[PDB]
From Swiss-Prot:
GO terms for biological process: proteolysis. The keyword Secreted applies. The active site is at E143, H229. The lineage of its organism: Bacteria, Bacillati, Bacillota, Bacilli, Bacillales. It comes from Bacillus thermoproteolyticus. Keywords: Calcium, Hydrolase, Metal-binding, Metalloprotease, Protease, Secreted, Signal, Zinc, Zymogen. Ca(2+) 2 binds at D138, E177, D183, E185, E188. This is Thermolysin. Thermostable.
Amino acid sequence: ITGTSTVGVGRGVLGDQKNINTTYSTYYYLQDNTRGNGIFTYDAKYRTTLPGSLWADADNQFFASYDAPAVDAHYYAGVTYDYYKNVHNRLSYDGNNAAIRSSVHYSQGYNNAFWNGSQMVYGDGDGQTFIPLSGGIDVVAHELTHAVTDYTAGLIYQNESGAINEAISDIFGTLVEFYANPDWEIGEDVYTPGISGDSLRSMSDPAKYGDPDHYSKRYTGTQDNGGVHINSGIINKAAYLISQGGTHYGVSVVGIGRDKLGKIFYRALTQYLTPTSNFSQLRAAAVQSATDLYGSTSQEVASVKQAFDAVGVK
Ligand SMILES: [Ca+2]
Ligand SMILES: [Ca+2]
Ligand SMILES: [Ca+2]
Ligand SMILES: [Ca+2]
Ligand SMILES: [Zn+2]
């Protein structure tokens, strides 16, 4: 853990070569000392006990297939850190350079990734529905954004507040993807290696995969903790409209770009949203955020208003 900072090289899940910040002490550890209190990547070794062992490597080369998820987890955690630092002046997820820890090779054939309240966890996928989810920069940013949310708004993971929590992670997950071949889809890089052109969720058109793109169409049952991954499509659609514009259900929205989208939603996240905020309170938080930044008469406030009107959120 105490060692000499250095730079290693390896290949990611998608076979792309990347340099990665490591630490040398007998072994080369996946420990990035250049970012906050450090970014640490662990090997769970197909087990479920966490975090596992700090990834140790003999030669500082990571070209083994078994290394691939660790390379991308380590690397994309760094990119996501840079994003929040450089774009939003936030230092790590807690705002005080908290150590970012990630575990890969979690369980066997685990088709999911998550923030467990203290760290990143990535499954390898079963190789048909998913390949190792570390390969998706939007996936990585999505999960770390949960840390940001938990330390700020604190949106509980249930019903509409949970839907907002999920949406925030999709939105900033996408903005990081744009920050680093970007798009307004979620997990396309790691989802379904057999079929091309699909994804887990779409922000541009949520209904593509059965998720609501309007408040009238919202899920109200009990599964998915009240549809946190489902009803997020409603907010994801609004976020997309604010950035890219377009006409949705007859309501025209003027786009203001991704950078203003990020500034608005980040401010909403950190200044106005609470653990129990619903879509309507999010709407109000976004309108006030844009008002703070750009003025009550600005096109940015109008676009946010037209966006939530478009997805039926008053
Ligand atoms: Ca090696
Ligand atoms: Ca992409
Ligand atoms: Ca994407
Ligand atoms: Ca696919
Ligand atoms: Zn999530």
